[PDB]
Amino acid sequence: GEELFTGVVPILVELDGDVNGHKFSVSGEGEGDATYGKLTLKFICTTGKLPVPWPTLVTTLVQCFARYPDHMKQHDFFKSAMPEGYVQERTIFFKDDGNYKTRAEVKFEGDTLVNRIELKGIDFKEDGNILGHKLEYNYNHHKVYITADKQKNGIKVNFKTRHNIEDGSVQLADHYQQNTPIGDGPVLLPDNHYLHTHSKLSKDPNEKRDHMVLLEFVTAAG
Ligand code: NI
């Protein structure tokens, strides 16, 4: 499981989404280097303009790339599910607004780590922060709390994210996350701990399509 992540791994992401009826797709390619906890990825909205802000999509758009320090390698659930993979399900509640519901499969396809996702968004306000496109194009750092869930043979994960708005306030998002394996094979069920994540968003100046360039570093602690 862990031996598939010793070098640079290529990554592919495929998202089909539906938010308040506005349908879209996003595709991403990049690579991940789990020894350093590094991800570099470029995403394109392939159906035109993206109907929600790119920041709301980041957490949906591969925690198996987290750097687990040596003293904690016995708590890396995500790499232990590989190569067959795990299913990731979330509900994300945006305070005073709507919510996303997501299901993704993460697994190897030959050499490539694949993250295939379905997303549904309901109850968003036409003039709210999301559909109204009022979020800044940036990303704060976060702690992602991970607990075992032994009766689903996986893990439960919860965190909040704070998205900046031009007026100084924030849009809060509360994530609730269940990961479970795809295989009938062994996995590691960790002790409680968290992931510390840093993310930088930017644009390719030679790209005319609606896109996002993403640099992420993720580290396990606690
Ligand atoms: Ni930090």
From Swiss-Prot:
Effect of substituting residue 139 to C: In mut1.9; shifts fluorescence lifetime from 3.03 to 2.74 ns
Effect of substituting residue 62 to N: In R10-3; matures to the red-emitting state with excitation and emission maxima at 555 and 585 nm, respectively
Result when mutating residue 197 to Y: Gives rise to yellow-emission variants. In EYFP; leads to yellow fluorescence, folds faster and more efficiently at 37 degrees Celsius and has superior solubility and brightness
Gene Ontology annotations of biological process type: bioluminescence; generation of precursor metabolites and energy
Consequence of substituting residue 165 to V: In EBFP1.2; shifts the excitation and emission spectra to shorter wavelengths and increases quantum yields compared to BFP
Annotated keywords: Chromophore, Luminescence, Photoprotein
Effect of residue 139 to A: In Cerulean; leads to improved quantum yield, a higher extinction coefficient and is 2.5-fold brighter than ECFP
Signal peptide, first to last residue: none
Tissue distribution of the protein: Photocytes.
Impact noted for substituting residue 63 to H: In P4; leads to no detectable fluorescence. In mut2.2; shifts fluorescence lifetime from 3.03 to 1.94 ns. In mut3.3; shifts fluorescence lifetime from 3.03 to 1.88 ns
Complex formation: Monomer.
Protein name: Green fluorescent protein
Organism this protein belongs to: Aequorea victoria (Water jellyfish)
Gene it is expressed from: GFP
